[PDB]
Each structure stands twice: as C-alpha cells, then as structure tokens.
C-alpha cells in the first residue's frame, strides 16, 4: 500500500522543491518537464521519487520496462559476441580475428542479433548452446 510513500502530486516536500528544479539540458524548461514527469511517482518525506520494484504493473515502468529493455540489449551484445566467437573459431587463424576484428563479419552478426531470444531458445534445444561436462577442460579437483 506504501502508507509512508505519498504520491509526489500530493507530497508537500516535492511540491516546494519542484519549483526550483534545475535545467539539465539547453532547454530552459527542462526542470519544468522533470517536475511534471516525476509527479506521477511515489515520493518519500524528502520529496524525491522512490521507485517500486516488487513486480506491480502500476510501477512496471520503474523496473520491469527497464528490465525488458536492458535484457534485450544485453542479450543482443552477448549473443552476437558469442556467435562471432564461434564463427571465427573455425577459421585458419582464430587468434588474429579477435585483436583484428573481421568487421564485415561483425556487422553481419550484430544486425542479426535482433532475433537473439528466438535463436537462443533454438540453440538451447539443438544442444549447441550448452556443452556437456565431459567435453570441457576441467580442474584436477
């Protein structure tokens, strides 16, 4: 319920501080736009937006929409980095392709990473994502 978190539209600490919001960019109304945007959040006793991350879809834009947007991009960086590393491993000189990146091969993989979650599920089902424990270098216990 967050009884100790008043909304920022009815928070007197935020209302006395939103009129003195500074401009972060060259726009002279940057502090006014931030005052209207942060009014919909939940504020504490010091009039700053406290974010709720527990899983409520009312506060889905606090963490879940950052979570969905991050994991897509971070999955994209990991998947095209993994797929480039697999492709250059089959070449004559796999070592030199890491310090001297085959840039046309890199752009080909990086634009193909928009369908990484469908490619990750399919490669997990095919067994080419996860290696078996018998086929991996192992410490001597």
């Amino acid at each position: 319920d967050f009884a100790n978190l008043t909304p920022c539209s009815e928070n007197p600490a935020y209302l006395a501080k939103s009129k003195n919001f500074l401009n972060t960019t060259n726009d002279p109304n940057s502090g006014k736009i931030r005052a209207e945007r942060y009014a919909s959040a939940l504020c504490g006793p010091e009039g700053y937006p406290h974010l709720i991350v527990d899983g409520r879809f009312t506060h889905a834009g606090d963490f879940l929409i950052p979570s969905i947007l991050f994991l897509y991009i971070a999955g994209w960086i990991g998947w095209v980095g993994r797929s480039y590393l697999i492709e250059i491993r089959e070449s004559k000189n796999p070592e030199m392709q890491e310090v001297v990146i085959n840039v046309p091969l890199a752009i080909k993989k990086m634009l193909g990473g928009f369908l990484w979650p469908l490619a990750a599920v399919g490669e997990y089902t095919s067994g080419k994502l996860v290696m078996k424990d018998s086929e991996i270098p192992t410490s001597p216990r």
């Binding site: 091969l105 080909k108 193909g112 599920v121 399919g122 089902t125």
Partner: protein
C-alpha cells in the same frame, strides 16, 4: 502441412503443434479444446466481470467488455439504458461455461480414446477422416461450417424479431424489431457506409441477407465439390488453407476493430463509451474521445485496439504460412547473408 519434400520432418517442441496436422483425430482434439477454451473465456469472464460490475457507474468506464455485448443484445437493461438484472448475464455466463466442460471432455476423448488417425476407425469416423489434398472432403467440412454460421446469423435475427428484442441506442431502450428490410439494394448500398448504419431494422435485415447467403453457400459447398478453377489458382495444402483462414480472419479483425470504434448502433455509448477518434502514431490506435485519466481506456478502446493488433499479427501470421505454403524454406534467409 508443408514438408519441403522431406517425408520425415520430426518438428521440435516449439513447433510441436505441427505434428498432428496430418492426423485427423488429433486435429479434432486440439480444435475442440480451443472451442473449450474459447467458451470457457466466454463463461468465466462473464462471471468474472459481473462480480466486478458496479451498477451505479457506467460499465464502459469500469473496463468490462462482455456485459456490454449482452446488454446490446438486450439482456438486463431497463427503460433508461441502465443495468437492473444481474441474472441473464449469470445464466449465459453459466451456459457457456458448462458447454466448455462438455467441449473440454470431448477434446480429452479425441485425445485419448479416439484414434490419432480417423482412417483406422470403422463406422462414421472413417467418413470424418479428412486429408488435406482431398478438395471434395474439404468442401463438405466447409459447407457444414457455413450452415452453422448461417444458422447463427439467423438466430440473431430470430432473437431480435421473435425471441426477445435488441437494444435501440437512439431511443435508449430495448426494442423488439418488426419486419426488417427485404430489398437487396439497401444492403448493396451498405458497402459504403457500413460503419454508420444506425438502424436496427437494417442490421437485422442485413443479418437475414447474410444468414440466407451463408446457408445457401453451405448448401452449394456440401452438394457441389470444387470445380477445378479454384484448384488451379488456390493451393490445397494444410498450411495453405490455414493461410486463407488467417488472411480472412485478419480482414474480419480489421473491420471489427474499425466497427467497434466509430459505430454507435451496435456499440452504444452508454454501454461502451464515446466513439473513438482514429489516431495513428508509430502504430494505428483508436484513442479515447473523452480521455478518462489514470489509464482508463473505457472498454471500447480495449476492444478496438486489441482487435487491430490481433488482426495485424494474424496478417503477419497469414504471411508466415502463405510463404510456407508457396514453398519458401525460411532458412534461405540465413544462407542469403552467409559468405
């Protein structure tokens, strides 16, 4: 089902529904369970939102979609467009939910007890065994389904004329219609202004004219097989007939999304809300005219903006299967970008 020549396509778990496309008995079992799940949603979510219904507020602003559908048919509505009876919504929400249990049983019957292929069965199930490359069998299936869609449209015309009465959004009351239109010229004139008809006596007469057309169309498809010109120009594969269905129901989705947002007759404003402005941004979306705050989207902005995306992603689903039916391997995209 498109196999690309390979007779032994195994299919993974994400494409696991493609495994029974050549199996007639399992084709029934998944589709009957779909109708079990469809009638369960018509039953449970009628009973879900009749518990959430507040009779003092308008049901459009509450965010309810199934009670305005039954209220437009003329159940539970008094003389002022309000809701006074919670019982006919409870009966219809119970009748759909019990019929979902009969369908949910018959799907488990066709999964377990009935054979996977109906060619093995002897009796009437051998006549029900359909193959995808048999056009004469598919028109019998199509003609019988056109009979029930024609009987459904005549039942709605029957419900308005005799078995009760429809709602009149102009006079804000439930009105029993009498003697609808019979001239074919006004229905032919309704191709232009289809979304602004504003007349019960032409809506029912249009449903009479399409009810007689679908039943007469189902007579022709049962009695007469495909002639041969349709076999030359249309494909008769498993994914090809699904492609025509996904394309056909995407066009019906786009019409019903547009008809929900601008028409006031079949979607009255005291049951649903104000007629939506056709906005467009990075996607087309029908926005609220009155713009009720706190993310309201008053129950016509949920019907119209879901039946556009579900029509768009069936238009994408029609394009996925028609490309598969015509012979595109879809792995040739990956070899196009290979070195």
């Amino acid at each position: 089902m498109q196999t690309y020549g390979n007779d032994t396509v195994q299919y993974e778990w994400w494409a696991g529904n493609a495994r029974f496309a050549d199996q007639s008995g399992l084709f029934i079992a998944a589709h009957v369970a779909q109708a079990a799940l469809t009638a369960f949603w018509a039953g449970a979510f009628t009973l879900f939102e009749i518990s959430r219904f507040d009779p003092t507020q308008a049901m459009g602003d509450q965010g309810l979609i199934l009670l305005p559908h039954l209220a437009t048919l003329g159940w539970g509505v008094g003389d002022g467009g309000q809701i006074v009876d919670t019982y006919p919504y409870f009966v219809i929400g119970s009748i759909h939910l019990i019929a979902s249990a009969v369908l949910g049983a018959g799907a488990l019957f066709h999964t377990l007890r009935a054979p996977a292929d109906l060619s093995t069965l002897k009796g009437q199930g051998k006549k029900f065994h359909f193959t995808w490359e048999n056009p004469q069998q598919l028109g019998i299936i199509l003609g019988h389904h056109l009979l029930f869609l024609g009987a459904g449209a005549l039942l709605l015309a029957g419900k308005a004329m005799y078995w009760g009465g429809l709602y009149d959004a102009t006079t804000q009351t439930v009105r029993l219609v009498s003697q609808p239109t019979l001239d074919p010229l006004v229905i032919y004139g309704y191709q232009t202004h289809f979304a602004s008809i504003s007349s019960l006596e032409d809506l029912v007469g249009g449903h009479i004219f399409v009810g007689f057309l679908l039943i007469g169309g189902g007579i022709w498809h049962i009695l007469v097989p495909p002639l041969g010109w349709a076999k030359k120009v249309l494909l008769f594969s498993g994914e090809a007939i699904l492609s025509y269905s996904l394309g056909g129901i995407a066009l019906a989705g786009f019409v019903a999304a547009y008809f929900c947002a601008v028409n006031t007759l079949a979607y009255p404003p005291e049951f649903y809300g104000p007629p939506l402005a056709i906005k467009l941004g990075i996607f087309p979306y029908f926005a609220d005219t009155v713009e009720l705050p706190m993310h309201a989207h008053t129950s016509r902005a949920w019907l119209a903006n879901a039946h556009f995306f579900l029509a768009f992603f069936f238009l994408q689903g029609h394009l996925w299967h028609a490309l598969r039916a015509l012979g595109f391997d879809f792995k040739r995209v990956e070899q196009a970008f290979d070195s």
